[PDB]
Amino acid sequence: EKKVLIVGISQKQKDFDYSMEELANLAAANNMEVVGEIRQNIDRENRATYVGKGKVDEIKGLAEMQDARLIIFNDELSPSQIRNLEEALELDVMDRTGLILAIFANRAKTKEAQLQVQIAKLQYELPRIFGQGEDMDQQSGKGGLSNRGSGEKKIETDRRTIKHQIRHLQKELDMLVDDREVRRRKRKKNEIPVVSLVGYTNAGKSTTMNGLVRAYSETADKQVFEKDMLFATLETSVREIVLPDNKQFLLTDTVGFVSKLPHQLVKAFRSTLEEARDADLLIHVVDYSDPHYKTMMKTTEETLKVVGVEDVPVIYAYNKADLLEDEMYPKQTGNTIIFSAREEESLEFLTEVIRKELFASYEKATFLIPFEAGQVVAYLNEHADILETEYLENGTQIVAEVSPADLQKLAEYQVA
Amino acid sequence: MLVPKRVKYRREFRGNMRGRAKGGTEVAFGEYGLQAVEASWITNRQIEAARIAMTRYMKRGGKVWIKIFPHKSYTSKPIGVRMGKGKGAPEGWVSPVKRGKIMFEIAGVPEDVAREALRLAAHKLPVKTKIVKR
Amino acid sequence: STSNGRDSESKRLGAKRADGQFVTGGSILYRQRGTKIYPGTNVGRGGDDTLFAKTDGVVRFERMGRDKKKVSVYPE
RNA sequence: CUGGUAGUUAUGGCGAGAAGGUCACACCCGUUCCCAUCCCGAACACGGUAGUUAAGCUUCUCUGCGCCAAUGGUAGUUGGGGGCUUCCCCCUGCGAGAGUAGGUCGCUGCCGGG
RNA sequence: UGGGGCGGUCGCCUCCUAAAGAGUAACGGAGGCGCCCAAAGGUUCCCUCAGAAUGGAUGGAAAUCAUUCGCAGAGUGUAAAGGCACAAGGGAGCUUGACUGCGAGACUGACAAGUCGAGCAGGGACGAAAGUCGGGCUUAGUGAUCCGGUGGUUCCGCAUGGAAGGGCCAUCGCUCAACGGAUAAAAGCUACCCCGGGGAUAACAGGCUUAUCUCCCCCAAGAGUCCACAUCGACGGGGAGGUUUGGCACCUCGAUGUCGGCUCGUCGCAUCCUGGGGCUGUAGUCGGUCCCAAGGGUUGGGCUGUUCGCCCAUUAAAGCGGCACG
RNA sequence: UCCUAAGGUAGCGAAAUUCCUUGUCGGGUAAGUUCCGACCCGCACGAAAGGCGCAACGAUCUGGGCACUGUCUCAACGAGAGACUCGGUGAAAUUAUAGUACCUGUGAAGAUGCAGGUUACCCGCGACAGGACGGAAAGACCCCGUGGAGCUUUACUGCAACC
RNA sequence: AUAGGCCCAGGCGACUGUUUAGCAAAAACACAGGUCUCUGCAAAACCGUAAGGUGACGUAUAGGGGCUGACGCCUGCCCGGU
RNA sequence: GGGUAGCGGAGAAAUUCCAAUCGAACUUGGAGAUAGCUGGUUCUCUCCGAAAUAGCUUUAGGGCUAGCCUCGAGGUAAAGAGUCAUGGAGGUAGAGCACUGUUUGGACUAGGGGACCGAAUUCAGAUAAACUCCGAAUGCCAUGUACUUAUACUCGGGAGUCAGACUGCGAGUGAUAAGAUCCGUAGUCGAAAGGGAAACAGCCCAGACCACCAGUUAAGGUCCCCAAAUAUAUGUUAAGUGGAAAAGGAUGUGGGGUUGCUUAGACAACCAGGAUGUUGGCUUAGAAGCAGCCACCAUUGAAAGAGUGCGUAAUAGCUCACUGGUCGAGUGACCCCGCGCCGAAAAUGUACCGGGGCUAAACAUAUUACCGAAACUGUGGAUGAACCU
Ligand SMILES: Nc1nc2c(ncn2[C@@H]2O[C@H](COP(=O)(O)OP(=O)(O)CP(=O)(O)O)[C@@H](O)[C@H]2O)c(=O)[nH]1
Ligand SMILES: [Mg+2]
Ligand SMILES: [Mg+2]
Ligand SMILES: [Mg+2]
Ligand SMILES: [Mg+2]
Ligand SMILES: [Mg+2]
Ligand SMILES: [Mg+2]
Ligand SMILES: [Mg+2]
Ligand SMILES: [Mg+2]
Ligand SMILES: [Mg+2]
Ligand SMILES: [Mg+2]
Ligand SMILES: [Mg+2]
Ligand SMILES: [Mg+2]
Ligand SMILES: [Mg+2]
Ligand SMILES: [Mg+2]
Ligand SMILES: [Mg+2]
Ligand SMILES: [Mg+2]
Ligand SMILES: [Mg+2]
Ligand SMILES: [Mg+2]
Ligand SMILES: [Mg+2]
Ligand SMILES: [Mg+2]
Ligand SMILES: [Mg+2]
Ligand SMILES: [Mg+2]
Ligand SMILES: [Mg+2]
Ligand SMILES: [Mg+2]
Ligand SMILES: [Mg+2]
Ligand SMILES: [Mg+2]
Ligand SMILES: [Mg+2]
Ligand SMILES: [Mg+2]
Ligand SMILES: [Mg+2]
Ligand SMILES: [Mg+2]
Ligand SMILES: [Mg+2]
Ligand SMILES: [Mg+2]
Ligand SMILES: [Mg+2]
Ligand SMILES: [Mg+2]
Ligand SMILES: [Mg+2]
Ligand SMILES: [Mg+2]
Ligand SMILES: [Mg+2]
Ligand SMILES: [Mg+2]
Ligand SMILES: [Mg+2]
Ligand SMILES: [Mg+2]
Ligand SMILES: [Mg+2]
Ligand SMILES: [Mg+2]
Ligand SMILES: [Mg+2]
Ligand SMILES: [Mg+2]
Ligand SMILES: [Mg+2]
Ligand SMILES: [Mg+2]
Ligand SMILES: [Mg+2]
Ligand SMILES: [Mg+2]
Ligand SMILES: [Mg+2]
Ligand SMILES: [Mg+2]
Ligand SMILES: [Mg+2]
Ligand SMILES: [Mg+2]
Ligand SMILES: [Mg+2]
Ligand SMILES: [Mg+2]
Ligand SMILES: [Mg+2]
Ligand SMILES: [Mg+2]
Ligand SMILES: [Mg+2]
Ligand SMILES: [Mg+2]
Ligand SMILES: [Mg+2]
Ligand SMILES: [Mg+2]
Ligand SMILES: [Mg+2]
Ligand SMILES: [Mg+2]
Ligand SMILES: [Mg+2]
Ligand SMILES: [Mg+2]
Ligand SMILES: [Mg+2]
Ligand SMILES: [Mg+2]
Ligand SMILES: [Mg+2]
Ligand SMILES: [Mg+2]
Ligand SMILES: [Mg+2]
Ligand SMILES: [Mg+2]
Ligand SMILES: [Mg+2]
Ligand SMILES: [Mg+2]
Ligand SMILES: [Mg+2]
Ligand SMILES: [Mg+2]
Ligand SMILES: [Mg+2]
Ligand SMILES: [Mg+2]
Ligand SMILES: [Mg+2]
Ligand SMILES: [Mg+2]
Ligand SMILES: [Mg+2]
Ligand SMILES: [Mg+2]
Ligand SMILES: [Mg+2]
Ligand SMILES: [Mg+2]
Ligand SMILES: [Mg+2]
Ligand SMILES: [Mg+2]
Ligand SMILES: [Mg+2]
Ligand SMILES: [Mg+2]
Ligand SMILES: [Mg+2]
Ligand SMILES: [Mg+2]
Ligand SMILES: [Mg+2]
Ligand SMILES: [Mg+2]
């Protein structure tokens, strides 16, 4: 495990004590031993070193007396700040932006995600080509009037050759959207309602789905990855849930997300967060035990705003209510639920909640199905919830709560 | 992923792969083996991939022996560097495999699953192989 | 960008006279470090471990006990 | 038979067991003298022989360890010729390492006592 | 010097490359040196290590004892290699051979230089004697000439006697380290530049290679409302092309004009549209993917020198590349 | 609280100065990497190398409008001087000898001349520029030469002048 | 036949003028104004080996040199180093 | 009309002007400055014939000494070359774990732990340019009186060379790329013509003294261009493979070796049966062989599953496993080997046999004739050296 160091400044932030300990957890995930940490209270970042010429001395001092090799900075660095910090430390440096890119590149097990990481990582290098251009300009070849060589300057050329790779990945990533819409064709051709779980990382998202599947799914042997790791899930998964009274819907998962996320990964997120934009309901799971939960909501709602997830009704779910002392879960107030995704009751209570938003238009009805030719009695007993059935001599009178698309699909069999 | 903890010298010659295997050409521990028919270099990533693909199929049943280890190391130069100015920085570890070497082992499972697991492993390696029995 | 690149000139060690070849007194028979060959009859060891004949004769590389050799000179 | 002293790549060594002797050789007794201990008559040096084969020493038996060691086969390879050239094949000459059949509880020379 | 510059290096010792004599290159792979010792040298006599187990223990994983096992698992001033237990390793006594004049004969070697040496003479140290001793177990610890300083001298001394001054022997003064040392004495800019040469050597274009790049596949964990293969396919593996970023330096320096546009085009198919067909998560409309097909088509503007890109408005469609980036 | 001789004041600020950069917001346009107005987050503004403004002036640089138009969509026609035919006079750069095709390949790695094929009766006149790595100029760019010259300095050694 | 196209906004330079005969007419040079410094007359400064001259047939409201460049508002801190 | 002259003058300053010339005018002299640099260097024949390497160098495209060439003269205890016999030094290829590193599985465990990590021991199995208990083939140094064969050495006069190239083998750098770069070893080119690779310095054969309208062969070839076999015998290929390219895929084709049933009737077909407790029991609105779970006997029989597939909604229905008969010659299961198939895409024009064209005029094994060079021979000439008369 590599030994690294953690550096950051205040610069008018409001959770500098919290945004500094994420960078410890983000470093643990990338398999680095955080040896020490540096904090400086300043109002604005330095234009040349990000910390001011003073503290550059005691990062060099501290990394020499702690055997560090890499320095992580809590915020993204300008190309010039990177250039100046290198020479002043003669050590590898890395900002927070590249720390997620190191996390995502090691946990992308599909080219769906692998292409998106790689295009975003290439857009990061384009501004740094200048510093690469500056150092490579020492051996400029020099001279003057050549009359027999090349076109423009070297800085023009090496900028063109890196933009060329970007547009190629853009073409490949554009064709990715066409592929994913083919797999949604059956869902969209029908009108199966879809509800998408969202929320901060380690909120209890997978734990919820893996419970609603083991209880109300025909193929219960289709579980998901629930663990203690940060960023366990990095994909969307769909599962068909069928309630005991013969109602069906689709439950989707989502990759969790953290604050200070690079703006060139949200463009990749925009693709992977498509199931939520078309969701007809959202479940916002929040880590209720952490006192930093109120701040967790803000960073996730300001993130759904970027990708176009809006106007979908939301129900806020507060997980981990077992840990809180004297908590009488489950309980519902407003659009808010208190539960723990471990007991069946919370999961049995949650399912009865969603039924109100999705299936509220299924109204009472009656029908008369002749015995001689049936094959509709089966249909009622699947696409409805029978209450009572009166097997008569004329045939089979039935009473059931059928969908509005089944009233007029069976408008001839209905009786008074 | 198999990597030696220590090395006396960082840089090494590349060597040659002439002749049959010096030893280890007979299956000893298990009852099924994967024997190379031609000679090739095997990196540690290929060993990892083959082992994973072969253990997943048996569903954590039986035992598997890795009969080769990547003692050697190899170096490389970045794009845009002229020739000279010393040797390159090491990149990975390889196991020079000569023909006739048995380099995987299976025991504790019947004929079918063992043969299928060996077949699944053999597609991850860059060398032509065959399945032998004790 | 290279810390290596240096060596020492060779010292031309080895055997300077062959077995069975007539040899003149005082001539070097073997240049060597330490004692890979021991001095036998009518031969001595120099300050830096060379072996030189002491009388005119014929060179012969015999064998001492199992794991070591010697060279001797026999007059005519 | 035994004491002394040399040669020979342990086939001679290590280990195990038995027998023997005051003819020789040792153990043994002593510190006045010559001589000695980073202290000590343990050793070395000197003066003696009440007791002993317990050990040293000699002889006898073994294959447990070690050591020496073929024949056949094989790898490799000089020369000549071929291929589908990470390397491979054919003809002639040379020819291992490992493994094994097997061998070993030594063989010789000189001087003094019995 | 895989163009030059920046970086690194320049002398000597040890090992691998070095292909079982010796020798053998690269800006190939690893290390050391520019000293130290008055005993860490000579001689005579004596003996033998690391480590492990058991008990006392102040005192533990580890101090100092006692027994047993123990071929070197230690040590050898120092880097490595070769060697050394009949010591070249460890003690004690006496001493200064860490001497003077030499040296048959050899090794190495273009020269200058470097290395070994029996034995003779003078006078000694240790030892009863035989005998050993011209520094250190062996190989690094060092620089010529010229010019000056210090000591000795039966040498010369410009008419003669002296002297001044030289000669000979011994010895001192170098990071002359760019270490066979140009001089006692030495840094930069040139886009205002000039001459003699070179494709022996760089920038454009051609050539070889294909790491990289584009495209095509093999196995199949998985995703896809169940469901590996409608549509994607991770970890790994195999090729084709010569459009990218690179490597090499083969033609051209007695000149091969170098970016974008304009005019004119012409080829390839890995097909953007149109034509024919298979599968579909193909009810219909709208689509996806693959197969056969190169016959014709494949816009007008705002910003930027821009190729490219973003945007406005259309279109059946607004293809990707080669031709000295035509 | 440390160090220094002391720690950038006013004014201005994506600038003839900002790499990231087409910074962010507003205006202008159907669409504005250029332009104007703001923010300050000044890689690397800043006070006589002057800082910030400023009426008049400018064959100065930059952005937008009215009018006007062959600059363009997209090219017609007409006049004159050449060019074209006839009579007079009459050069030059260049030049190894030439009865001087195309394709694929080979070769000092880009062939009219070499190999295999495919085409081609002999001689001219008016036109166009793909090739003859076409003509002109012993490449300026690059490197080399123990070549040169001009310039600088706390490189070495000197000289004038002054004390 | 001959005889101003006009308007809005910004950078630079205050203005008229000068400049690379033969690629660059400009934001570059000059300028009026500001400031620092040297010079008491055989003045300082400059040419010349000297004689002899310019400065000047002048005399500190005069003469030589450095920087800035109309005009308006201003021109901050440091004398350790040279 | 005059003034300022080059170690200088003038400059509202641009290295600007000083007779079409100015980062320092023109002219004559020193002067035939110097040039380790480029170019040039004129008649013939005869004999011999290299090098592109080492050390040092203000040295790297220059020089010096040595190495390699040539001419002359010397002296023999003949010293040069090849093979044979004999003796040696040396640790590479290979192999091995006896030392040192790297390393896999198992047993036990010091030590800490109120079971778990884990030092050392052992068992079995690997690995090494800078590991070695071992250790070749070649090469090298000598001895000989063995047998052949012609050089060696010393002294002196004269040089040139110090940019090398590719191919085979052994290594390094590189990516186990390059017509790359740098060494060792052998060859060819350089300095080599002739024949074959279509064309072609370096690949294969082979070394031109001159003439001939003579002969035999080498590499390579014999249907036509184009000299010589539409040769002989036995087989394989159907792909124009031959005449380009992998992982991977496959009822292509030929030859062998194994193994079930069968004229007391094999496989493929057709005719007939293919049933009863019973809808096996749970589960469900149901579940009747075929949503799911557990079980899976018996009855008649020659056979017949508490059911292989399709189907309903549950049924209904179609069909299979199995048995009897009908016709009457073989029919499935595995392994090895040879040759083929797909994978297979580029830019002026067929364009991955030189062309035509080939089903052999391709491939494998064996045999025999011929063609084929400036090679060797035959005939006639010219000439150098050594040694004899
Ligand atoms: N104490 C407590 N822990 C819970 C509760 N629900 C889930 N967790 C824990 O939270 C941990 C985080 O796992 P989970 O939240 O499922 O992962 P995730 O939400 O998919 C993270 P991402 O959003 O990036 O995919 C789990 O280890 C789980 O045990 C709860 O109600 N109480
Ligand atoms: Mg320049
Ligand atoms: Mg240029
Ligand atoms: Mg999740
Ligand atoms: Mg050496
Ligand atoms: Mg000595
Ligand atoms: Mg010495
Ligand atoms: Mg007796
Ligand atoms: Mg006494
Ligand atoms: Mg022995
Ligand atoms: Mg044998
Ligand atoms: Mg043997
Ligand atoms: Mg050799
Ligand atoms: Mg050698
Ligand atoms: Mg070297
Ligand atoms: Mg060093
Ligand atoms: Mg001198
Ligand atoms: Mg005298
Ligand atoms: Mg006198
Ligand atoms: Mg040094
Ligand atoms: Mg010098
Ligand atoms: Mg030198
Ligand atoms: Mg030297
Ligand atoms: Mg300029
Ligand atoms: Mg020139
Ligand atoms: Mg060249
Ligand atoms: Mg090029
Ligand atoms: Mg060209
Ligand atoms: Mg070269
Ligand atoms: Mg020319
Ligand atoms: Mg096609
Ligand atoms: Mg279709
Ligand atoms: Mg077409
Ligand atoms: Mg406009
Ligand atoms: Mg072009
Ligand atoms: Mg190109
Ligand atoms: Mg090209
Ligand atoms: Mg801007
Ligand atoms: Mg501007
Ligand atoms: Mg804007
Ligand atoms: Mg602005
Ligand atoms: Mg300024
Ligand atoms: Mg100032
Ligand atoms: Mg100004
Ligand atoms: Mg201003
Ligand atoms: Mg103004
Ligand atoms: Mg003017
Ligand atoms: Mg006319
Ligand atoms: Mg005329
Ligand atoms: Mg070619
Ligand atoms: Mg051509
Ligand atoms: Mg032709
Ligand atoms: Mg004409
Ligand atoms: Mg030309
Ligand atoms: Mg020239
Ligand atoms: Mg000069
Ligand atoms: Mg002006
Ligand atoms: Mg001009
Ligand atoms: Mg006057
Ligand atoms: Mg000014
Ligand atoms: Mg001031
Ligand atoms: Mg001062
Ligand atoms: Mg002062
Ligand atoms: Mg005049
Ligand atoms: Mg002047
Ligand atoms: Mg200038
Ligand atoms: Mg001029
Ligand atoms: Mg002027
Ligand atoms: Mg002029
Ligand atoms: Mg002269
Ligand atoms: Mg000749
Ligand atoms: Mg030359
Ligand atoms: Mg010479
Ligand atoms: Mg080996
Ligand atoms: Mg000579
Ligand atoms: Mg040389
Ligand atoms: Mg050379
Ligand atoms: Mg060479
Ligand atoms: Mg090569
Ligand atoms: Mg080459
Ligand atoms: Mg030549
Ligand atoms: Mg030839
Ligand atoms: Mg030829
Ligand atoms: Mg050819
Ligand atoms: Mg014929
Ligand atoms: Mg073919
Ligand atoms: Mg195949
Ligand atoms: Mg074509
Ligand atoms: Mg014939
Ligand atoms: Mg002849
Ligand atoms: Mg004749």
UniProtKB/TrEMBL annotation, chain A:
<keyword id="KW-0342">GTP-binding</keyword>
<feature type="binding site">
    <location>
        <begin position="319"/>
        <end position="322"/>
    </location>
    <ligand>
        <name>GTP</name>
    </ligand>
</feature>
<dbReference type="GO" id="GO:0003924">
    <property type="term" value="F:GTPase activity"/>
</dbReference>
<keyword id="KW-0479">Metal-binding</keyword>
<dbReference type="GO" id="GO:0046872">
    <property type="term" value="F:metal ion binding"/>
</dbReference>
<dbReference type="Pfam" id="PF01926">
    <property type="entry name" value="MMR_HSR1"/>
</dbReference>
<feature type="binding site">
    <location>
        <position position="253"/>
    </location>
    <ligand>
        <name>Mg(2+) 4</name>
    </ligand>
</feature>
<feature type="binding site">
    <location>
        <position position="206"/>
    </location>
    <ligand>
        <name>Mg(2+)</name>
    </ligand>
</feature>
<feature type="binding site">
    <location>
        <begin position="253"/>
        <end position="256"/>
    </location>
    <ligand>
        <name>GTP</name>
    </ligand>
</feature>
<dbReference type="InterPro" id="IPR025121">
    <property type="entry name" value="GTPase_HflX_N"/>
</dbReference>
<dbReference type="GO" id="GO:0005737">
    <property type="term" value="C:cytoplasm"/>
</dbReference>
<feature type="binding site">
    <location>
        <position position="47"/>
    </location>
    <ligand>
        <name>Mg(2+) 1</name>
    </ligand>
</feature>
<feature type="binding site">
    <location>
        <position position="206"/>
    </location>
    <ligand>
        <name>Mg(2+) 3</name>
    </ligand>
</feature>
<feature type="binding site">
    <location>
        <position position="233"/>
    </location>
    <ligand>
        <name>Mg(2+) 4</name>
    </ligand>
</feature>
<keyword id="KW-0547">Nucleotide-binding</keyword>
TrEMBL record, chain B:
<dbReference type="InterPro" id="IPR047873">
    <property type="entry name" value="Ribosomal_uL16"/>
</dbReference>
<dbReference type="InterPro" id="IPR036920">
    <property type="entry name" value="Ribosomal_uL16_sf"/>
</dbReference>
<keyword id="KW-0689">Ribosomal protein</keyword>
<dbReference type="GO" id="GO:0022625">
    <property type="term" value="C:cytosolic large ribosomal subunit"/>
</dbReference>
<dbReference type="GO" id="GO:0003735">
    <property type="term" value="F:structural constituent of ribosome"/>
</dbReference>
<dbReference type="Pfam" id="PF00252">
    <property type="entry name" value="Ribosomal_L16"/>
</dbReference>
<keyword id="KW-0699">rRNA-binding</keyword>
<dbReference type="GO" id="GO:0019843">
    <property type="term" value="F:rRNA binding"/>
</dbReference>
<dbReference type="GO" id="GO:0006412">
    <property type="term" value="P:translation"/>
</dbReference>
<comment type="similarity">
    <text>Belongs to the universal ribosomal protein uL16 family.</text>
</comment>
<keyword id="KW-0694">RNA-binding</keyword>
<dbReference type="InterPro" id="IPR020798">
    <property type="entry name" value="Ribosomal_uL16_CS"/>
</dbReference>
<protein>
    <recommendedName>
        <fullName>Large ribosomal subunit protein uL16</fullName>
    </recommendedName>
</protein>
<comment type="function">
    <text>Binds 23S rRNA and is also seen to make contacts with the A and possibly P site tRNAs.</text>
</comment>
<dbReference type="GO" id="GO:0000049">
    <property type="term" value="F:tRNA binding"/>
</dbReference>
From TrEMBL, chain C:
<feature type="compositionally biased region" description="Basic and acidic residues">
    <location>
        <begin position="6"/>
        <end position="17"/>
    </location>
</feature>
<dbReference type="GO" id="GO:0022625">
    <property type="term" value="C:cytosolic large ribosomal subunit"/>
</dbReference>
<keyword id="KW-0479">Metal-binding</keyword>
<dbReference type="GO" id="GO:0003735">
    <property type="term" value="F:structural constituent of ribosome"/>
</dbReference>
<dbReference type="GO" id="GO:0006412">
    <property type="term" value="P:translation"/>
</dbReference>
<keyword id="KW-0689">Ribosomal protein</keyword>
<keyword id="KW-0687">Ribonucleoprotein</keyword>
<comment type="similarity">
    <text>Belongs to the bacterial ribosomal protein bL27 family.</text>
</comment>
<feature type="binding site">
    <location>
        <position position="66"/>
    </location>
    <ligand>
        <name>Mg(2+)</name>
    </ligand>
</feature>
<protein>
    <recommendedName>
        <fullName>Large ribosomal subunit protein bL27</fullName>
    </recommendedName>
</protein>
